UniProtKB/Swiss-Prot annotation, chain A:
This is ATM1-type heavy metal exporter. Keywords: ATP-binding, Cell inner membrane, Cell membrane, Ion transport, Membrane, Mercuric resistance, Nucleotide-binding, Translocase, Transmembrane, Transmembrane helix, Transport. It comes from Novosphingobium aromaticivorans (strain ATCC 700278 / DSM 12444 / CCUG 56034 / CIP 105152 / NBRC 16084 / F199). GO terms for biological process: monoatomic ion transport; response to mercury ion. The gene is atm1. It comes from the Bacteria. Its EC number is 7.-.-.-.
């Protein structure tokens, strides 16, 4: 299976079930019809040169223009109709097959999409929208062009080349056969080597192009700064040098295309000269008719027409196979966090959260939690704080099981979250993260995202609870207002309110505020804190905060130091104990004073 | 005037022609001539080679006077093969010879537009998204290149060959042959064009559906965490799938139409082939034509219609190219709001005073902001300009750098109207630390050296020191060679502002503007950077435009604007004593900070 050479053959054999689905009957029928079109088309293009030969034969055999006019007429007509029929068959196979192609590449993409959602967070999917888009565009284009060239150029040419070998064998040579075979081998080898060199030149050109373009764009988007320093000539010279470098590379890349074409024509035309001279010589001895000259010439040109593109074809097919392999690699990549076999659903009857001796790090060379243990009572409002090495920033990710502990475990109610389904576990948890993100869609879509079947009543209710309802009401399109980019831009508080609303639609027993106010300004922070407190009403709530004053009203505060639970208690108990929390508090307090001094 | 004409493809091409025939270079003109010569050799060759095939066939079938016919036929078969190879050689040689001319032409067009865009007004607000603009420019470049290649190396050669075939068919056949082929070419072009219009519309729909499916997929992938938090994997999968199906449907229709165009084309071509060949054989029957004539006619027709096999695509590309190029020329034609007057002298700053003399201005003609603003900034003084929300203070710097001109009134530096001097000297006299400094996608050292064209490593080190960012840079692993901006290391607000300060230090202008320089900063960063700003403002004329009065309280004098005019002027203490607009503002601002300080 996967236990193979990992060449194009493996990738292709892997792709084969997509083309011959065994899910879909209609598509299989389409495949068969396309293959029939290939065969009819080839039979037609192989037959038509014979008709041309006979027409010439009739006009040379040959005392006069006698009953032979009728014969010659019939045969040229057969030839022309043959040409049209060949093209008709080719275009009909493309037309029949196209749906199969489209479904196959769609299903491949969907499989990759699904596996990517199953894969680990640590792949760190944080990148540029335009760049990933450019990569995906280039790649889909790649796989499509490859697929088309393999099925509809290379394969028909293999059939045709074999047929020409047999026919040339039975009717000529067999010096003809070896001559053509050598011509084809020299042709492919030359095209291949020249193409490898060409692909390198292309890559250099593409890079230089990107550089000239980047300079131009950076300049235009910094028009103000350029004016401030009167730097127009400078930026112009800067674009110009880059542009020249690009143009030089482009001239080389294109010229190499000229060289490939010339090499190809040399090979074809040596073959043509040889075949035709030899055919004429065979004519002189009465072995071959004059029509044979026409016949061989047509067979050779027809054979070498698809090979006119072989370079591009080669490049394309190669790249496609690469890209497709990349796809399959993702599908194969193993999943770090998985449900255990026959994992039960998590049943939340009493929403306690337990960390039991948790040892964890994102990477095995940097341990962060060194045996963290704590208990959060059901329905309590708890805070988790600490200085720079505490490891509090792992809590949310562990609770949602983005990762597993190296040692120890997390429990919700009485149950190890590692032994339940990921879906039930996440169904029980709400989060308002530090940087809330909006989908490129309406505000209603964004709020309703909290639960799958969320009704507009639920959206209104959540928006009310998050106290963002009025702001939406004063929008012309209300809930149907598009947001994100390209959409309406929300303030930080408005975004955090959309996130809160989203979690309200979910209505989870356990709610986490994960540095929820850390990006907000002071007034925004203070405003949203009453909403958060209200929204924590009958939930078990865990708030991870940098700034202690924002969580001082907690039922209890867990203080972490060096990946372990250092101190525990109410804000007052902790101030009395005069330990780490008190120091932190004093420190922050002092700092708040200093800023106010200015 | 060539611009005084209909706005079509012909005009665009006529505009582009000087680029191809520079009259600056001569080397390139010689290259163009050489390329045209290769077109002619190539056409003579491809026209000549079928006669060689014809003769070879003629020799074999009429060996009466063409003897030894084996020798004659061999010679002709070899002439035919050599003719083919030679045709290809001539064609690739015209491409190879011309390519430099093409690249230079399009480079010069791009450079012309680039210069023009830097000349055009700020109000166009060119700052927009990088990826979108880049994708557009890539698409356009490919478009114009492809158009140029198809125009020069496909359409034009085919026009030459078509005329030649018409003449040759005329002289040796028909002339039913001539009319048949011409009608065929006409039917071919008309069919291809009309089918291509439909095809292009389908292509656009396909592309739009493609972009929507891709955007859904990308939004999901970059929001993997959110998708996880809400268990939305199935929803995202289904949401991608529906879009993907819409795209696949569009793609299927779009590809299928290509099959239709190919069939229509082959139908036309093959009617012409059947008729022409049948006619040639019938002419043979009457002793009018040789059998080699059949080979000759057939070969001529296939050679003719081979470039036309691409006519659909060609038509789509050339058209698109012509559109894109027109857009280029449109930008080049767009007029320049702010230009130097003819023969403008340099601004000569011997004593760097600044005057606003009765200035009336607005960004737009329906909304006037300054209503007769007048003030004098003494040479070497440090002054501030403050006011409430409609004061118009945010126009001052833009007017000084002459991003816009006054509707009425004028601005002077050292007694010289800045409207009447070269823009480059004027801007040479001015330094600015703006509210949001922007960095080039380049090294931090490049960004600092940007202050002056020939900036040495020493000048940069000195500026980094004066801006007090030198230590921060020293602690960078790559130092001055550290890449910054987007696509690079992220600097804090203070670090960026310090880079801006360092830039102006490298420039060393006589007049310095702080244009809300500290307004985006946090309080402590503001307090830190203010001492730096005071140091660099040492012996310069400094004008500080600030929202928060406490940051400018130490000014030599303060200009208070209200409603686009100068309401109040004087020292901070004098303004507090007058108990007017500045005092009110001062009190108000103090009050707010107190309340803010209260909320700890
Ligand atoms: N022979 C070259 C391909 C030649 C080629 O690309 N020809 C057509 C398209 S298939 C073209 O791009 N331009 C038409 C022409 O100038 O011949 C190769 O093997 O890659
Ligand atoms: N006849 C159509 C299509 C021509 C076409 O696409 N020709 C080459 C251009 S590179 C090609 O791709 N042929 C497809 C094939 O033979 O596989 C037109 O006039 O544009
Ligand atoms: C309908 C087409 C669906 C197929 C999906 C193909 C996307 C291609 C991405 C390949 C990227 C691989 N890489 C890194 C080598 O560029
Ligand atoms: C916004 C459209 C106008 C952009 C023109 C500016 C010229 C620089 C980029 C165009 C050509 C660069 N390229 C792609 C050939 O390297
Ligand atoms: C000379 C090379 C520079 C190429 C610049 C790209 C041109 C594209 C202009 C886009 C304008 C919109 N349009 C023409 C597609 O309708
Ligand atoms: C990170 C890139 C590799 C995986 C790509 C994700 C699969 C879905 C890609 C969407 C394909 C776009 N198209 C052509 C179907 O519209």
């Amino acid at each position: 299976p996967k236990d193979a050479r990992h060449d194009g053959w493996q990738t292709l054999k892997r792709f084969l079930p997509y083309l011959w689905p065994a899910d879909n009957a209609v598509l299989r029928r389409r495949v068969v019809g396309a293959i029939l079109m290939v065969l009819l088309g080839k039979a037609t293009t192989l037959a038509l040169p014979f008709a041309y030969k006979k027409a010439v034969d009739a006009m040379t055999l040959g005392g006069g223009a006698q009953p032979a006019l009728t014969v010659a007429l019939a045969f040229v007509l057969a030839y022309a109709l043959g040409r049209f029929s060949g093209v008709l068959f080719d275009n009909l196979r493309n037309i029949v097959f196209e749906r199969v192609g489209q479904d196959a590449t769609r299903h491949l993409a969907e499989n990759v999409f699904a596996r990517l959602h199953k894969l680990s967070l640590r792949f760190h999917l944080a990148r540029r929208t335009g760049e990933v888009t450019k990569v995906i565009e280039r790649g889909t284009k790649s796989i499509d062009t490859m697929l088309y060239f393999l099925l509809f150029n290379i394969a028909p040419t293999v059939i045709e080349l074999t047929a020409v070998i047999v026919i040339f064998w039975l009717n000529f040579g067999l010096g003809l056969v070896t001559a053509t075979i050598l011509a084809v081998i020299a042709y492919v080898w030359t095209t291949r080597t020249i193409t490898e060199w060409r692909t390198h030149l292309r890559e250099k050109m593409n890079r230089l192009d990107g550089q000239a373009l980047a300079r131009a764009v950076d300049s235009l988007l910094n028009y103000e700064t350029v004016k401030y320093f009167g730097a127009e000539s400078r930026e112009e010279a800067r674009y110009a040098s880059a542009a020249r470098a690009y143009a030089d590379a482009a001239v080389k890349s294109e010229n190499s295309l000229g060289l490939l074409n010339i090499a190809q024509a040399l090979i074809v035309n040596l073959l043509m000269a040889g075949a035709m001279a030899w055919t004429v010589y065979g004519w002189s001895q009465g072995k071959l008719t004059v029509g044979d000259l026409v016949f061989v010439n047509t067979y050779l040109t027809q054979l070498f027409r698809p090979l006119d593109m072989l370079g591009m074809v080669y490049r394309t097919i190669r790249q496609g196979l690469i890209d497709m392999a990349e796809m399959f690699r993702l599908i194969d990549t193993h999943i770090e966090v998985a449900d255990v076999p026959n994992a039960p659903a998590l049943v939340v009857n009493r929403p306690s959260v337990t960390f039991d001796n948790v040892v964890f790090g994102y990477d095995r060379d940097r341990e962060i939690l060194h045996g963290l243990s704590f208990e959060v009572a059901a329905g309590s409002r708890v805070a988790i704080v600490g200085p720079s090495g505490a490891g509090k920033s792992t809590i949310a990710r562990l609770l949602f099981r983005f990762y597993d502990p190296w040692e120890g475990r997390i429990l919700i109610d009485g149950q190890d979250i590692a032994h339940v389904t990921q879906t039930s576990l996440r169904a029980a948890l709400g989060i308002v993260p530090q940087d809330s993100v909006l989908f490129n869609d309406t505000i209603g879509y964004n709020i309703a995202y909290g639960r799958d079947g969320a009704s507009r009543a639920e959206v209104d209710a959540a928006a009310k609870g998050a106290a963002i309802a009025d702001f939406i009401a004063r929008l012309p399109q209300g809930y149907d207002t598009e947001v994100g980019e390209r959409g309406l831009k929300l303030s930080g508080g408005e975004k955090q309110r959309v996130a809160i609303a989203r979690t309200l639609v979910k209505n989870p027993p356990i709610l986490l505020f994960d540095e929820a106010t850390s990006a907000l300004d002071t007034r925004t922070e203070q405003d949203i804190l009453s909403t958060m407190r209200a929204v924590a009403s009958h939930r078990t709530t865990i708030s991870i905060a940098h700034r202690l004053s924002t969580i001082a009203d907690s039922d209890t505060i867990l203080v972490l130091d060096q990946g372990r639970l250092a101190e525990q208690g109410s804000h007052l108990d902790l101030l009395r104990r005069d330990g780490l929390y008190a120091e932190m508090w004093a420190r922050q307090a002092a700092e708040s004073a200093e800023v106010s001094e200015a």
